[PDB]
Design an enzyme around this catalytic site. Structure first.
Site, short mmCIF file in Angstrom:
data_model
loop_
_atom_site.label_atom_id
_atom_site.label_comp_id
_atom_site.label_asym_id
_atom_site.label_seq_id
_atom_site.Cartn_x
_atom_site.Cartn_y
_atom_site.Cartn_z
N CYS A 173 -5.29 2.72 13.56
CA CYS A 173 -4.50 1.88 14.45
C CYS A 173 -5.16 0.54 14.73
CB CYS A 173 -4.22 2.61 15.78
SG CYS A 173 -5.67 3.19 16.68
N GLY A 205 -18.66 2.21 -14.17
CA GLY A 205 -17.50 1.35 -14.21
C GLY A 205 -17.30 0.53 -12.96
N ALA A 219 -14.73 5.70 -19.88
CA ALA A 219 -15.38 6.54 -18.88
C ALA A 219 -15.37 8.02 -19.24
CB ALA A 219 -14.72 6.34 -17.53
N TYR A 273 0.81 -1.20 0.00
CA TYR A 273 0.00 0.00 0.00
C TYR A 273 0.85 1.27 0.00
CZ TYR A 273 -4.19 -2.77 0.35
OH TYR A 273 -5.18 -3.66 0.02
N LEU A 279 -17.20 0.38 -19.25
CA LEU A 279 -16.29 0.16 -20.37
C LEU A 279 -16.85 -1.07 -21.08
CD1 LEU A 279 -13.67 1.01 -21.74
CD2 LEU A 279 -12.54 -0.81 -20.45
N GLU A 280 -17.28 -2.04 -20.28
CA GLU A 280 -17.85 -3.28 -20.79
C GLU A 280 -19.13 -3.66 -20.03
OE1 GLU A 280 -14.93 -6.34 -22.06
OE2 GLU A 280 -13.41 -4.95 -21.29
N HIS A 286 -15.14 1.60 0.72
CA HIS A 286 -14.02 0.67 0.89
C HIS A 286 -12.79 1.37 1.48
CE1 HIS A 286 -15.79 -2.12 -2.46
NE2 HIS A 286 -16.38 -2.30 -1.29
N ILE A 309 -10.45 3.73 -3.58
CA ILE A 309 -9.67 4.23 -2.46
C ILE A 309 -8.81 5.43 -2.86
CG2 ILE A 309 -9.66 1.98 -1.37
CD1 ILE A 309 -6.85 1.52 -2.47
ZN LIG Z 1 -3.84 2.90 18.85
#
Ligand SMILES: [Zn+2]
Lengths: 225, 8
Positions: A116, A168, A209, A53, A195-196, A108, A92
């Site tokens: 934390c 999308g 898009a 990430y 797109l599809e 999401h 995200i």
């Molecule tokens: Zn904490």
């Protein structure tokens, strides 16, 4: 003045340079989704996942990454409808926010935020997350097997929507993929911009898009001038 | 409601 609820999926940010987090392929940036997007993958090798990430967050903030025509049109749509508009995204990234949208519900999570492992509290975060940070810290991204965010507000907007537009989104990730059914159940006019195909939609358009979204938004805004 | 994030 219709109530409009828009649901966006990874596809809309593809043209912006954010490689679509495939699932039918099971590979997200050459990584197994079960390895980088499940609570198991994390506990198994947190350092790697954190690194994964960190790289996603890094790439998200590079020069060549910016909102495209689809993102912008959605900001224009909100400008026009104000409080009768709600944007829900499975993404995200922060492209909707950069385009001008506000009050975006990130079901999401968000790549530019963390929480934390103990309190769950959330705090903004743009840089890398190193082994030396605490309230431990993990990406504020909903992994498979975890509960989506804002579901209460989302389901309320779905029962209220006059028009539900899914952009999308792959009819593969639930509960998001089930929203169209809910909307349809409460009488909303359903629209799919993809797109599809592979996605109960009464109106649908396919193509990039940055081409389809702006066009539909213009039609809609003009249609109720 | 809705259940956990999951893939068909
Ligand atoms: Zn904490």
């Amino acid at each position: 003045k219709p109530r409009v609820l828009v649901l966006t999926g990874a596809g809309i940010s593809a043209e912006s340079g954010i490689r679509t987090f495939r699932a039918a392929d099971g590979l997200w940036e050459e990584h197994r989704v079960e390895d980088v997007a499940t609570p198991e993958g994390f506990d198994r090798d947190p350092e790697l996942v954190q690194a994964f990430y960190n790289a996603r967050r890094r790439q998200l903030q590079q020069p060549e990454i910016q909102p495209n025509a689809a993102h912008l049109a959605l900001a224009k749509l909100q400008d026009a409808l104000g409080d009768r508009f709600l944007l829900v995204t499975q993404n995200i990234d922060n492209l909707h926010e950069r385009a001008g949208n506000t009050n975006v519900i990130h079901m999401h999570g968000e790549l530019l935020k963390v929480r934390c492992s103990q309190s769950g509290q959330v705090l903004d975060w743009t840089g890398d997350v190193t082994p030396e940070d605490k309230c431990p810290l993990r990406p504020h991204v909903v992994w498979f097997g975890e509960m989506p965010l804002g579901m209460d507000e989302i389901y309320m907007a779905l029962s209220m929507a006059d028009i539900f537009i899914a952009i999308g989104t792959s009819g593969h990730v639930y509960p998001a993929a089930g929203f169209v059914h809910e909307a349809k159940l409460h009488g909303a006019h359903t629209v799919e911009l993809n797109l599809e195909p592979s996605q109960e939609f009464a109106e649908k358009y396919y193509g990039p898009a940055s081409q389809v979204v702006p066009e539909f938004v213009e039609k809609l805004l003009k249609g109720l001038k | 409601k809705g259940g956990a994030k999951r893939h068909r």
